[PDB]
């Protein structure tokens, strides 16, 4: 402004898009979920709804550059819609996510991109004993719907989900959630794929 | 890398958009159906709800390439609109499906398209009976919309629906899935249209 | 596929877009309904859901060609949105239409366009007496929005709807179903609109 | 066709879009309600439910031709997309309104335009009392959500909504219903906005 | 009015868009509420669901014009999507905000911006003790998502919120209403984010 629309329009209307990644090229996504508020339970259908934001990390070439070329600039916003994302998704939700967030990344000098959607998921649970002392315990997959483990990589910086940020009056107290990273095969496919799995320990609100 | 995106160009930004199959150059869809869960039955409206992924694989002449001319390339991920795809449709739906994944395919140096959206269904089923040990049986019918036998065809890798994806704690127990192929006639059209029938069979959890 | 590309470039990309009929040049869409399903009745708010599909035909000099010149090619499929298609509205909706299938018509040589959608529909309709064996009788009327009959008339090949597809375990039984046409003036506008009247009797099982 | 195509062509392709009123070149929307059906009431959230269609009539000079150069057109159709529209806006929605009909208007050779759109809206309304004999009377403004007085001015061609499209057997009768005009002031800005104030009036029955 | 399509023309066609605001030039939003209705309360989910209106003020030199070169105008209306507008979030919303107004702003010669989204929003709230004459109080956040203290501050010309627009004969009265500016800090980020808290009073109408 003129120098970050000058950085912008170099990044974006100059070159083609990222195809995204490859076997050759591949890429790590570091995950890290934030949860909110488990806010309903449905026992006649076995589904529960969360709310969170889950934080993305990955790094290209594509988007690196010279600080010095453009006014000491570091680091810039920028729409979803402008960069390459991966495609995180839920394999166990029964309902689409629905963005409870603005679709904006942060891009830096070195080609790191920071993207943390806010999201409420309906997911498959089995809530009983939620009223018990004991609690009890449900899980769900993330994971690259497409790309496999040869292209695409996750790694959690904590095993420990942040629950800083939870609601606290909440219906539903959490008693722990991991967030523990796995691999998988699928029957379509020879190659692994690569998933965070999120496990959360519940109950209700004395 | 700079290698693929030129072959991306090549194929979607050169040519125009392959035009749908004909009676002259006719097609062959592979269907395949992985069960996930049941979510939910209401017996007020005789509607059940099925949340699953369908394997779709074709192959076209016109996405073909060769490897050696792009780096050795064998295969690449692309959005769905990038392509034609199949207008596969559940006939007796009750609502809208829900796509539930990201809407991206794999293209083979073959011409080979493999794609897997997850869904959620609500389709017309009278679930009387399914407290019963016996259980209760429904079926809905996947076919193009708009393309004759003559046009797409529909086969089958396996009559057995995958359950091994089946939701454990599910309200409800998958006892038989069946996706048979089968033809049918309608009253506007002297043609035969393909439908692969997938046939379930389940009950309450006991 | 090499013929069928140059067909579709000629019609869609080097001409302008029907622009709609005209008093001058005016043109008739037959409809037909094939009932699936009667889903669920609301007796609460008197509003009942129907599932369909709705068969469209009608004829464009503009998509007219000749097969000899395209590799003898008789038909094909397209893309809604690569052609005009009419506005067919019902007056008595209470929800927007769903659509429940693809959005693909197939045009012929002689120009004409057939289109079926397939819709859930939510409509007004007071289903008291429902329970009984006489049943209870509803309707809704479907007709272009916009365009007065000098412009899109309506017509029914039969008016018998299809239900030899409805739904073998459904909650409700049709007794009978009818799609009649109809003449209707509204206080804006001096011009007559032609609607396809959709009547329907049924009982629970 | 031909003569119509070139038309909306100079109009639209030629031209830069109408950029919206001002204090210098002000306009004056003529709104007018037929309402259809009261659908549903919820006693426990107190909010009603209608569907209706919403007459809307204004006029620019932009959008005039002359017929004899374009083969003594009067008049024609076209997307809402393909020209402006003014921003009418319940004040007291709950829920976004839920569009019924095609977004497709009317414009005519002096620049008149008309759009009616079909709607259901979900507003503000305390329904205690509506199984009285008396009934109970709830109401809702419709006006420019943006422009001021002195930009869009409204009016109304009759004070009494048309009724005459009412459902037969809703789950609510229709004692009365008025669209009459109204100015307002708002905390945040000194001009007043103008308004048109539905007011019904209804029951159980 | 010739004037004004110029007007508009030199802006929006001619520039680029402003790319956001960043540390070497940031920027203010004054922010406000009328709140209209709470419409409904759940106690099973502990969320409640309010209606109202968020008048949002910020300036920008990009937006600047000579009223003498445009025929004496001093402002206009356009399309939000036309000009840059500022990512304000609910940090505890539930569900996607649903906007109820149209979305146009007022531009000004001296490069202000006023923009009013009408919104109803479900946001985590404990009504525990709302049938009471003492009520209870539920709060939420508003702040960028994505923009820290540096780039994005925010203001109040009042802490009281507007309710002078309030409904009559809402199922709940509002016995208070607040709109104060707050800092917060958040484990992924080192910097600062500003947000204007709405802390709400109310119970049921008695
Ligand atoms: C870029 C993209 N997403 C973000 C999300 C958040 C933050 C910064 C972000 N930066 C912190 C403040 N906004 C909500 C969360 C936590
Ligand atoms: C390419 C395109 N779609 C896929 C879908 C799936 C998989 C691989 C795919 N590869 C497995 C992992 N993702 C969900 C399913 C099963
Ligand atoms: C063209 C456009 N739509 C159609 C819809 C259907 C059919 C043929 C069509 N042809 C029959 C088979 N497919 C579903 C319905 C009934
Ligand atoms: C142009 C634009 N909208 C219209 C809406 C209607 C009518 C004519 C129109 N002409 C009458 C018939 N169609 C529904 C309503 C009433
Ligand atoms: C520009 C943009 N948004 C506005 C919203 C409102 C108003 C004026 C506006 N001007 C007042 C009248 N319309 C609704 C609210 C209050």
């Given at each position: 402004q003129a120098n970050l629309m000058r950085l912008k329009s170099d990044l974006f209307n100059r070159s083609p898009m990222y195809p995204g990644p490859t076997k050759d090229d591949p890429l790590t996504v570091t995950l890290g979920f934030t949860l909110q508020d488990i806010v309903k339970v449905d026992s006649?259908?076995?589904?529960?709804?969360?709310?969170?934001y889950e934080q993305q990390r990955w790094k290209l070439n594509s988007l690196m550059w010279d600080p010095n070329?453009?006014?000491?600039?570091?680091?810039?916003?920028?729409?979803?819609?402008?960069?390459?994302?991966?495609?995180?998704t839920a394999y166990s939700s029964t309902r689409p996510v629905?963005?409870?967030?603005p679709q904006?990344?942060?891009?830096?000098?070195?080609?790191?991109?920071?993207?943390?959607?806010?999201?409420?998921?309906?997911?498959?649970?089995?809530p009983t004993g939620v009223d018990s002392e004991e609690g009890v315990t449900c899980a769900v997959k993330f994971?690259?719907?497409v790309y496999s483990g040869f292209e695409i990589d996750?790694?959690?910086?904590?095993?420990?989900?942040?629950?800083?940020?939870?609601?606290?009056?909440?219906?539903?107290?959490?008693?722990?959630?991991?967030?523990?990273?796995?691999?998988?095969?699928?029957?379509?496919?020879?190659?692994?794929?690569?998933?965070?799995?999120?496990?959360v320990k519940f109950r209700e609100r004395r």
């Open positions: 006649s259908t076995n589904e529960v709804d969360l709310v969170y070329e453009y006014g000491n600039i570091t680091d810039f916003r920028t729409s979803a819609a402008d960069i390459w994302t991966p495609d995180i629905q963005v409870l967030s904006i990344a942060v891009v830096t000098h070195d080609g790191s991109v920071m993207f943390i959607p806010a999201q409420r998921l309906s997911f498959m649970c089995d994971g690259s719907w996750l790694k959690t910086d904590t095993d420990q989900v942040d629950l800083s940020s939870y609601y606290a009056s909440s219906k539903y107290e959490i008693l722990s959630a991991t967030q523990t990273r796995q691999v998988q095969h699928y029957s379509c496919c020879p190659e692994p794929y690569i998933d965070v799995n999120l496990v």
